[PDB]
Every structure is written in structure tokens, then in C-alpha cells.
Structure 1
Amino acid sequence: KVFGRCELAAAMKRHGLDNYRGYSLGNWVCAAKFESNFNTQATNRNTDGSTDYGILQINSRWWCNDGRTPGSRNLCNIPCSALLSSDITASVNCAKKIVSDGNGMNAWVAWRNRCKGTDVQAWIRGCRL
């Protein structure tokens, strides 16, 4: 599924991401924009052989099992395919664990390089929240 911008904002808010760990909703929407282009089915292979999955490009190196990342962990205790569902619950639940791990949203390289320090409000502007 390719979410609309306000559509994703609404789902992220209902799942309690708005201000989770102090990060306002626009930060999460901006991160999804540049991690996945709002596409739940996005996958991208990392240099180390791990793969990033889903709307928030969650990495098999630490957070999910894909059976092809030898030596990795599965800290969210889910198959990485669950992070590709049309329903974002799995991805949100796992993102909450990631952003609590100590480094905040810096875990998302696209957020650090393209959202952090910008007017992230713009990503929710005009949405009925």
C-alpha cells in the first residue's frame, strides 16, 4: 500500500506515534516519506547484507527476522515480512522500540539527513488531525 500523506499521519497518530519519545507527528511522517515514499512494500538491501523493510525501513540486522541476515538479531520478535503489511501496526510497534533504544530518531538515516532540523510540521500541514 502507498499511503497518502495525511492518511499516514492519521494512522501513525492513532497508533500513538505523535510525540512518542518527544518526536512530533511530522517527524514520523517526514521519516516515512524519505525512507519509503509512504510505500508499505518498500525493501532495500544494505551494504552489510541486511535488508530494510516497510514504511519505516526497519533493518533486519537488529529488529526483524528475514532468515537471510546471518548473525543478525530480531529485537521486535517478528518476521520482516510483517513490516510490509498494509496495516502499519507491526511497523509502529517496532519503531517505538527502535526510537527508545538510546539514539532517538537518528536511527533513521533519512530522518537525520533530510528531516532533522527542518520544518517537519509541513508534513502534517493541512491534515485534519
Structure 2
Amino acid sequence: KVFGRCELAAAMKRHGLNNYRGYSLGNWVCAAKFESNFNTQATNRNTDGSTDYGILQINSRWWCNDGRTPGSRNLCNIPCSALLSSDITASVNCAKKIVSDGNGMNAWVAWRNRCKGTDVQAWIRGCRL
């Protein structure tokens, strides 16, 4: 499913992402925009053979099992396909563990490169939250 901006903002808020670990909602919405373009079915393969899955492009080498990434750790204990569902719950729960990993949102390269230090507030502007 391809979420609309405010729709995703509201769903993420309901799932406890607004200000989780100090990151305002605008950061999470900005990250989804640049990571998947709000599309839950987005996948991208990396050169190391691992694959990024879903709305937040979570990596198979550490967070989920896709049965084809040798040495994968499956820290969120879920098959990677669960991260592509229209219900963002699995994605959100796993993202919570990732952002708590000690490196914050820098774990998401698109966030670091395109959201970090920008007026992330613009991403939730106009939304009924």
C-alpha cells in the first residue's frame, strides 16, 4: 500500500513513533518518504546480497530473515515479508529496536542525507493529528 503523507503520520503517531527516542514525527515521515516513497511493498537489494524491506527499508542482514542472506541475525525475529504488509505494525516495532541500537536514526541513510537538519516539521504540516 502507498500511504498518503498525513495518513502515515497519523498511523505512526498511533503506533507511538512521535518523539520515540527523541525523534519528532516529522523525522519518521521524512524517512519513509525518502526510503520507500510511502510504499509498503518497496524492496531494494544491496551489493552485500542483503535486501532492504518496506516502508522504512529495514535490512535483512541484521533485522529480519528472508532466507537468503548468509549470516543474517534476525534481531526483530520476523520474516522480512511481514515488513511489506499494509499494516505498518511490524515495521514500526522493528524500527523501534533499530533506533534504540545506539546510532539513532542515522541507521537510515536517506534520513541522514535528506532529513537530518532540515525543517522536518514541514512533513506533518496541514495534517489533522
Query: Per the shorter chain, which TM-score range?
Result: over 0.9
User: Residue by residue, what CA displacement relative to the aligned partner does 1:61-87 show, whole Å, maximum 9, x if unpaired?
Assistant: 100000000111100000000000000
User: Residue by residue, what CA displacement relative to the aligned partner does 1:13-43 show, whole Å, maximum 9, x if unpaired?
Assistant: 0000000000000000000000000000000
Structure 1 counterpart SS, 2:128: coil
Aligned to 2:17: 17
CA–CA distance in structure 1, aligned partners of residues 51 and 73 of structure 2:
12
Structure 2, unmatched stretches of 5+, are: none
Structure 2 counterpart SS, 1:105: helix
Q: How much does 1:93 deviate?
A: 0.2
Q: How many residues of Structure 1 are paired with residues of Structure 2 in the alignment? A: 129
Structure 1, unmatched stretches of 5+, are: none
CA–CA distance in structure 2, aligned partners of residues 13 and 47 of structure 1:
34
Aligned to 2:72: 72
| Runs of 4+ residues deviating >3 angstroms | none
TM-score scaled by length of structure 1: 0.99
Q: How much does 1:57 deviate?
A: 0.1
TM-score scaled by length of structure 2: 0.99
Q: How much does 1:47 deviate?
A: 1.3
Q: How does 1:33-112 map to 2 (within 5 A)?
A: 33-112=33-112
Query: CA RMSD of the aligned region, Å?
Result: 0.3
Amino-acid identity (%): 99
CA–CA distance in structure 2, aligned partners of residues 127 and 59 of structure 1:
30
User: Residue by residue, what CA displacement relative to the aligned partner does 1:76-120 show, whole Å, maximum 9, x if unpaired?
Assistant: 000000000000000000000000000000000000000000000
Q: How much does 1:60 deviate?
A: 0.2
